[PDB]
Amino acid sequence: SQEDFELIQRIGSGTYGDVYKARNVNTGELAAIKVIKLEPGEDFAVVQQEIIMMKDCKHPNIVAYFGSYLRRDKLWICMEFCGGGSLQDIYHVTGPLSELQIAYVSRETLQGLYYLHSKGKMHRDIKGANILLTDNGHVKLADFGVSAQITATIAAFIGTPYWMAPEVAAVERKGGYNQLCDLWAVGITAIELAELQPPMFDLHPMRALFLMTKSNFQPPKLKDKMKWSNSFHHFVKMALTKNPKKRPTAEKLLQHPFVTQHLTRSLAIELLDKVNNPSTYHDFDDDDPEPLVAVPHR
Amino acid sequence: SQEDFELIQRIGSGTYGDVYKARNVNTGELAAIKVIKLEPGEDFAVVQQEIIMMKDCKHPNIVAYFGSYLRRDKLWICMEFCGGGSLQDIYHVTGPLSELQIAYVSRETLQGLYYLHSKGKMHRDIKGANILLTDNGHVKLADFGVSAQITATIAAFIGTPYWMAPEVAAVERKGGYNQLCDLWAVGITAIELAELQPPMFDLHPMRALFLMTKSNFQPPKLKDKMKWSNSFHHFVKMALTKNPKKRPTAEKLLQHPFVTQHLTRSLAIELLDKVNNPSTYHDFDDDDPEPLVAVPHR
Ligand SMILES: Nc1ncc(-c2cnc(C3CCNCC3)s2)cc1OCc1ccncc1
Ligand SMILES: Nc1ncc(-c2cnc(C3CCNCC3)s2)cc1OCc1ccncc1
Secondary structure (H helix, E strand, C coil), X not given: CHHHEEEEEEEXXXXXXXXXXXXXXXXXXXXXXXXXXXXXXXXXXXXHHHHHHHHCCCCCCECCEEEEEECCCEEEEEECCCCCEEHHHHHHHCCCCCHHHHHHHHHHHHHHHHHHHHCCCCCCCCCHXXXXXXXXXXXXXXXXXXXXXXXXXXXXCCCCHHHCCHHHHHHHCCCCCCCCHHHHHHHHHHHHHHHCCCCCCCCCHHHHHHHHHCCCCCCCCCCCCCCCCHHHHHHHHHHXXXXXXXXXXXXXXXXXHHHHCCCCCHHHHHHHHHHCCCCCCCCCCCCCCCHHHCCCCC | CHHHEEEEEEEEECCCCEEEEEEECCCCCEEXXXXXXXXXXXXXXXXXXXXXXXXXXXXXXXXXXEEEEECXXXXXXXXXXXXXXXXXXXXXXXXXXXXXXXXXXXHXXXXXXXXXXXXXXXXXXXXXXXXXXXXXXXXXXXXXXXXXXXXXXXXXXXXXXXXXXXXXXXXXXXXXCCCCHHHHHHHHHHHHHHHCCCCCCXXXXXXXXXXXXXXXXXXXXXXXXXXXXXXXXHHHHXXXXXXXXXXXXXXXXXXXXXXXXXXXXXXXXXXXXXXXXXXXXXXXXXXXXXXXXXXXXX
């Protein structure tokens, strides 16, 4: 029941409700609980779908589902607690991530999407706010709300299609995209972790979307042409292929040098320590540990 | 009240409900009545908006509003009766229209849109089914349901815009077009009246809209390159300008030769007679009317 957990503190805000740090009353285990307020009679098929998808995903790079409890218009969704927090929360304190840190995160995210895509699902909201870190440095993906929204909307034109002007047709269209769009978000997220914000972030949301549809649109690059290697640049160049049909899948991009190089969870531990560091030194004593083998000096 | 009219026969189907030929109980005047079934609690702001717009338009090329009556979930909207019927209804019996007939209809439609556009309104569903004819050959535009829908929807992204792939952005966009889209519909309608159906009519609605958004999209032409004049072709070429900013407005297109030439309601009377003709001859007697001036012959 809900009574098995005690909400400790709000740690974020999901697509729907608030996320709270929580503790189990008996086991003492930590967990993250998404509290969602439901209005009577409202379309439940959406939060219902999110739970099902969470319930249907068991992968080391996806936030694991513990349980869900509904009590009087208040729905709790229990999941594993990622101590590090969102990457966005991290690089807001931390500076920009390292290239190797971006590389590690990217490979793990791609591993998560690989799983989702084989299942035939898509995340459709891949960003720094949805990529979490465990205390040991593991990378998990979160927030299946958007995914759930898109699935639920699979169910009416305004006007008649054939008589629509091209600019009206662009707005009257629906669907027509697949899971390869997640790969684009990986490319944008790569930039996001590098430059503390996605490209075009200063524009209005509608204005940014309109620019992407223009025929003369060219995919973003990394501003510092010299700060990052050719692999990182090339990785983003592939991930940010405008044409979806020629865009590399999750497996093809996992075969890329930038993510196929040696990358361990040490890099995330580093990142976590920097967040736990708001100090370049500490007290110490360095002399000869054992007198028995202490080299003499006169 | 509703009791002032008696529904005679269904004459069409609007965006919302059925349209009935109707007669006034007292005056004996004919009228068209749109019967709309409303569910309790439903968004009325849309049919409410349609009435207001109809009520707000007094132009010789727009179907005039007589009244509207609501009685127990059943809303009547009374308007002038166009004896000829829809152009689509006409060319389904009639063959394709003449070039001069298409020209006459086009000028009158443009005159209607000119009025709407000066008021800052848009039709957004200009087609043969919405262009009516009076018994005397006058051309009126109808069906403000779509217009009303678009206005009412002026009031939430799925996912975050900046991380969206271009193909997702295309579907997540909204608005971004103006009344110039009506001019495109005029161009398509010109083809429709000429070839008994719009271009791409054999495609699926979604497929047709997707093709229009492609960068390599080229506006349709008239299939018979030799059946119609250069003016008609050029008229459609202007009206079907892919780029909305360079697309001629309603006034600019009214200055075009194809519609600035001599065109009278005789052409519509012709069209109406052909519909009232499902016969190339009839009984007659041709000899010398008056003997007093009858020229002799021996
Ligand atoms: N499963 C989760 N585990 C931990 C967090 C945390 C978020 N912020 C945290 C702070 C960061 C700063 N240091 C203290 C801890 S931990 C969020 C989680 O999930 C979020 C979520 C969002 C949307 N849908 C589902 C889950
Ligand atoms: N005001 C209207 N006056 C007459 C018709 C007619 C439609 N079909 C007609 C037949 C054609 C064949 N000959 C017999 C008559 S008359 C439709 C009208 O309006 C339609 C409308 C649609 C959608 N929203 C508003 C109005």
